[PDB]
């Protein structure tokens, strides 16, 4: 899956759009956050994307994971959310 | 759905168990949570609830989304979290 990082500041409207544009596009992508606030603000985001996708026939389904991440040379313990894209009407 | 509750100082581990033994039993249960740090428990015990249910060739699927909750004389926009068994796949 593409991924999508996010912090506690990144717009949950902002996230939400880039998040559609990908479930529209690959069917799937996934979110990896860290921290409180960045954990929030990626719900927040993925709640709002349900309503930009509706439209074209699509909802999702998120799947939350704990994964070890590298950043700054540091080794993070995150939460990442894969999630996947299907057809509301066929 | 049955409904839980998860609170800012919630433990992770114990929700787990609680959303495990549903998923098991009816196979679905819903998760709210109101303010950052119990949207960040939340999700904390949603991924470990996975681990309790994956041994039964069992995992789950989760679909985030606003809601209006009453708490007291107030009426508060909460995060609610829809938990549905999904049989595992490879
Ligand atoms: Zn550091
Ligand atoms: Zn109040
Ligand atoms: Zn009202």
Redesign the interface.
Known sequence: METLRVSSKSRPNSVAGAIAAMLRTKGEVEVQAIG??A??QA??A??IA?GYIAPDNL????????VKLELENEERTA?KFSIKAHPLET
């Open positions: 409180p606030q954990v929030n719900v927040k993925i709640a349900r909802d999702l389904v998120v799947k939350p994971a704990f939460l």
